Design a protein around this ligand. Structure first.
Ligand SMILES: N[C@@H](CCC(=O)O)C(=O)O
Length: 266
């Protein structure tokens, strides 16, 4: 009640199914504003905005990136993280992984979803574990360049993870600028490409046509997605409270089931 509720809050996000996607285009009708978008993060944004009694406007991140330390970016970070640092958006509501490095420059709510790094293969690929990848030659692998999975391997103290880091850093052509290009490479590489991909995306893709991909191995780590705000935001406490409210009242579970379980065609 002690923050501006006439302001339309700018919500940075990033198209990445099923978190956020464009509603299917139809004949003779043009969607505008937030109506263009659907998905888990759209439903989350709607519910958070309702909890806070605020208006909001989704504005997609202007470089298509989640956020990485970048010696060229103003404020030191690109992507949604940089938009928050530079006060170009008020909130980011996306599949933004909570990392120690990002917490030093922006604030996160408690997590609204838990996840881990996982492996996606085309069915038939003779890979069952991360260790397997490092013991063979024919299957190349990679991840989203410079995101949280990339940084996990760069920074990990586990020898296996450092071995995977050294390979990927020396073979950046086998990593990708969008996770969807990684998934296309899995599908189109005849069993010779594996993708390191966060488990909710992996699980979503594997459960839908063409049913040609699968997850192998245990998740490599455990972490969360959070709602992100620029430091000092007047909304920080209320947004965290709202996430906790939606977690306790079953609403986060409802929209997770909506976008993952209700959409299982395989
Ligand atoms: N969710 C990740 C991007 C995907 C990935 O790095 O695997 C991030 O916030 O950086």
């Amino acid at each position: 009640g002690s923050y501006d509720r006439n302001h339309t809050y700018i919500v940075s996000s990033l198209l990445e199914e099923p978190y956020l996607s464009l509603k299917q285009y139809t004949y003779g009708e043009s969607l505008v504003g937030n109506d263009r978008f659907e998905g888990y993060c759209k439903d989350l944004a709607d519910m958070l905005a309702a909890q806070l009694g605020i208006k909001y406007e989704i504005r997609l991140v202007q470089d298509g990136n989640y956020g990485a330390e970048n010696q060229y970016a103003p404020g030191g970070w690109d992507g949604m993280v940089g938009e928050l640092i530079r006060k170009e958006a008020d909130i980011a509501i996306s599949a933004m992984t909570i990392t120690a490095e990002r917490e030093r420059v922006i604030d996160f709510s408690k997590p609204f979803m838990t996840l881990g790094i996982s492996i996606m293969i085309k069915k038939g690929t003779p890979i069952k574990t991360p260790e397997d990848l490092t013991m063979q030659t024919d299957v190349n692998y990679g991840t989203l360049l410079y995101g949280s999975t990339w940084e996990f391997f760069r920074r990990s103290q586990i020898g296996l993870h450092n071995k995977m880091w050294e390979y990927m850093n020396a073979n950046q052509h086998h990593s990708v600028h969008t996770t969807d290009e990684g998934i296309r490479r899995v599908r189109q590489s005849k069993g010779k490409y594996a993708l390191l991909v966060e488990s909710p995306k992996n699980e979503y893709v594997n459960a839908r046509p063409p049913c040609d991909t699968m997850k192998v191995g245990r998740n490599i780590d455990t972490k969360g997605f959070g709602v992100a705000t620029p430091i000092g935001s007047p909304l920080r406490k209320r947004l965290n409270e709202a996430v906790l409210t939606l977690k306790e009242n079953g609403e986060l579970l409802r929209i997770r089931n909506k976008w993952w379980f209700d959409k299982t065609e395989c």
